[PDB]
Ligand binder design. Structure first.
Ligand SMILES: [Mg+2]
Ligand SMILES: [Mg+2]
Lengths: 445, 445, 445
């Protein structure tokens, strides 16, 4: 019931794994230490192995016994006969660092109990000592423990440990001298300038009123990517089903109208363009659609990670009308619901290192404003999706509100926020007959 | 001979298959969850393995054991001496899927028997209850476990898995070469261009101020759809009772004044029409009406599903003045109430694969606007109506407000939103003496 | 404890009722069926009497035996000696319809447990069978149960039923004396329609805010019922004593104000109308009043049954501000205390076969809402008494709230629930200067 908590079987398993593989010792040398172990024979074995890996790389069965022999230690450290059992056991695979980490943790635990014993000792043993000379000692010891637990990554880093990563990214980008696109491209040249391409660890938002084009624009982004991104994409159509999506997308990629598709009065050239774009999409095999209705961020994360390990690793994610996302815990408070959603999506993007398009709606506030250009406040709910987002870009198409516009066939992509870049107003030509946005070779902005 | 149904060979085999194959947990995690398993040690083991494949993938023999020792459950779930025997056993190849499948099947059956025994328990124990709660209890439990189970067409589909269905639909339409109508005809060819008929998965919205005749239009639609489609139709008269509904529908059908019905001031010349319409209606057994007051979403769902599986599968729905539809929990928050409403209607359509008309009101925002041609934002409440919709077509009779125009007797159907089609300015003619809209072969609209 | 539940006493009583009454076969046949019984001889007698009441009118004692001899089945169902006891027993009064309905309920329950065991067997016995065809079996079975149901009024209606009333209008509607009532006449003809009077074996709930007039209504009811019936009625006034109740009632009847009564400013023209109604209220001796404070449901039962035996059988029970009812067992937990009291009053309603008027309050959840027209949830405790009652109806007099109103003097009785009919919303008139609701002569609602 009561004992020093220690695991000693996985310990020997690590020992034999190091024996049968003289390559991966540095990675466990990061974690495991000679005094980390519990019993002294294992400690002798590991520290001898370490002294040898300084000098003698080959250490499996006999170099160990020889180095142990030259200084006269056989049968005082167990035995070569006993060592046979260690090399015999654990022919296991690269599942070694797990054992290493967990036993390293057990060592930390054992040390904690040791120091609690020391504190109890110094407590019941006064030695003519005061609370002020005692609690301060206790604080200093526990401080030395928690401060130094062989942990480097999670803690606040000195600047030289940050500039290494910064210069590393700069070398990753200079070592490939290429265009002014530091991530995913869209297919649109007027927008890649104000974005440097959809960057790879952000939460993009694509918001606009309902009849405006945001699902259309998003599908255009993803299909263009998947035509120039040899790497998967995802599409979560929580609103409409896959069979509307793909129809819209064939119309987009082939510049034929949607009625002609669904109803079936299309001409030989139309049939040909369809044939070609199909036979393209079926080769690259990027697009993966999920027409699930009421998802949660957990389901999103799982269904994205499933791809991201087996189909390689992914290039972007699209999410239609995230206000349908749910989390039943926060089912009463809608505001905190959306905040949890958005935080989880940003976390996902930082996890998988991809962008996360996340379509959203706007509120019926701009209608009584007479300009109609959507400002960042005009987001459907919670105000936090303008806070966790590293990019927002609204859509406004003046022909909807003004029949007397000189701005018809024209949609402008109001960048309404961008942390790592400028704001602006891109413009593009709308042709919803085949559900596409296209570039605008015309006046500047 | 008889036992609560379960095998163990499949179960333990899958468990060891996961012990020695740590990559294939997705395929297994999709299907089986801890509560599926029969015995407790296996459940503890499974939840720990999920916990580990979340963070730490490599788990074979003793990583799980130390995860288990973090709970201190040594030997409560068998023991390392036992779990090692499972590590030895079941070297199983790709037959993990089928073993997990039969484990799952036995568990679902087990749940069904549990429900049967529990209903028998509440039967022998009347518990101070009347059967009007008990039949509903049986229905609710059975379908709850059904739809809690039924969501097994899920996951991120591949692209070809989409295009199969898409092209199947396109062929199904081309396999019936007919007019430009894919859905439910409206009877108004001026309208059946822009819409291709009331599509089979949509939420249509017919809306205008009360003195425009929205109810007349929807009754005309369901009238025509019952006459054309040899298929059931439902109606929910939340506002008024059937005594007016039928007496107005017959006026729509047979071109006779409503007054001349209720007052008897008719003649045999018109009565020929009446007797014809009636006799046509009875031998079809088509038009179904519910003259309730405040029905909720799930009441509507159950009723529609009842009429569905009995009489083939329904073909249209009308829902007048949805605002009366309540849900008691969301009585404080009106906005979330209407949101829930609209979402349930849309998912009902998706369930039955039919259309869902739903009339709705407009606010006093546009009276003080000087144009009065309604817009999508004027929809009286909550804004998610126009976001969860597929087709919004208003009314604007100019005659009611302006008088000096030749557009009188002429009601126009402003399509103000359509995802899978265009916007428009349809014009139809009005004869309110018998409550109908008719076509208009007039100048270009 | 654990048994197939089946009514046998009331069963034989219904059978002997059919014996001693050839008339009452139609409506009883609309509910009970030969398969509705438990044992065989009862089924034999029922099918014989059904075949005979089709053709052979006289069946009380002898013609049953004559037909039983025509088919030659003597001593198969007992015998004529076994039969004589059936005509011997059950001299009961007209209370047979409730017996028939509860036996129908018991048959439905018996079917339910039979199906439950069938499903248990089907689950234990796959016989090489996918669970698809097993859950489908169960669900199809449940729907085949609940589909037929011998019930066609809670739900939509085929057009055959609609056109029944629609054409019945145009010929047969000379029925304007629709006094179709079964139970206690409420004294309100506009209200007696939608409720069908107080069905004598249910639980009524009258509830509203305090300044609203509910006690005045639930005194008006017993006030009329004392006069119309020649039957006693009970008044458990847990709020205020008899001396104010009666001083109110005299004023309700005589049409003078409480003030002049408790003051003495009243002349001959009031003296006469007091003397008359006083004389009427003495010449019947129906009403009994209990000015208690802290009654328990046990005391409710005891004090209804002290009088139910002496005076024939009581006609109406009236509890005032229910929530004061205590039970010192559940003196800590309020929720289960209220649920206990509700179940107890419903049990008493079943026991004496009388209607229970039992008031309640409304929490302050409507007053954070501009509607202020209450609903089923605004019910002040436990959400329990919206289940143990076949009737609820709430009140709303707007002119307590709005001083500007043109709805003053007026008070709608919202009916929030019925399990034996449709809900509605009456529109009375309130004149509290003499503490009365009157039937309203005005426009629609
Ligand atoms: Mg969309
Ligand atoms: Mg009172």
């Amino acid at each position: 019931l009561k004992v020093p908590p220690h695991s000693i079987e996985a310990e020997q398993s690590v020992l034999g794994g190091l024996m049968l593989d003289n390559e991966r010792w540095d990675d466990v040398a990061e974690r495991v230490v000679a005094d980390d172990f519990y019993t002294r024979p294992h400690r002798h074995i590991f520290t001898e192995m370490a002294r040898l890996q300084e000098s003698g790389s080959p250490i499996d069965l006999i170099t160990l016994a020889e180095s142990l022999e030259r200084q006269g230690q056989l049968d005082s450290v167990g035995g070569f006969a006993y060592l046979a059992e260690l090399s015999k056991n654990t022919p296991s695979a690269a599942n070694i660092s797990a054992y290493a980490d967990i036993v390293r943790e057990r060592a930390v635990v054992r040390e904690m109990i040791s120091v609690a014993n020391e504190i109890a000792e110094a407590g019941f043993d006064p030695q003519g000592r005061t609370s002020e000379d005692l609690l301060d000692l206790a604080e200093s010891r526990v401080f030395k423990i928690a401060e130094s637990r062989a942990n480097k990554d999670e803690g606040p880093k000195n600047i030289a440990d940050v500039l290494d990563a910064t210069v590393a990214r700069i070398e990753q980008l200079f070592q490939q001298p290429h265009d002014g696109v530091t991530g995913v491209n869209t297919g649109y040249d007027d927008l890649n300038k104000k974005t440097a391409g959809l960057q790879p660890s952000d939460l993009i938002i694509v918001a606009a009123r309902p009849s405006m084009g945001k699902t259309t624009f998003a599908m255009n982004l993803v299909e263009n990517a998947a035509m120039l991104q040899d790497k998967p994409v995802l599409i979560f159509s929580l609103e409409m089903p896959s069979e509307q999506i793909m129809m819209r997308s064939l119309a987009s990629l082939s510049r034929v109208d949607q009625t002609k598709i669904r109803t079936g009065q299309l001409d030989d050239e139309d049939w040909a363009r369809i044939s070609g774009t199909m036979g393209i999409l079926l080769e690259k095999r990027n697009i993966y659609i999920d027409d699930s209705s009421g998802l949660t961020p957990t389901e999103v994360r799982s269904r994205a990670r499933r791809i991201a390990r087996e189909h390689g690793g992914i290039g972007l994610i699209m999410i239609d009308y995230l206000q349908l996302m749910r989390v039943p815990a926060l089912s009463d408070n809608r505001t905190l619901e959306i905040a949890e959603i958005s935080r989880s999506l940003k976390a996902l993007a930082k996890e998988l290192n991809v962008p996360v398009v996340a379509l959203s709606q706007l509120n019926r506030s701009l209608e009584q404003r007479a300009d109609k250009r959507p400002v960042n406040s005009d987001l459907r709910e919670s105000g936090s999706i303008e806070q966790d987002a590293d990019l927002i870009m609204f859509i406004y198409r003046d022909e909807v509100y003004h029949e007397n516009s000189d701005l018809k066939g024209i949609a402008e992509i109001i960048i309404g926020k961008q942390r790592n870049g400028p704001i602006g107003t891109v413009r593009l030509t709308f042709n919803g007959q085949w559900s596409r946005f296209d570039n605008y070779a015309g006046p500047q902005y």
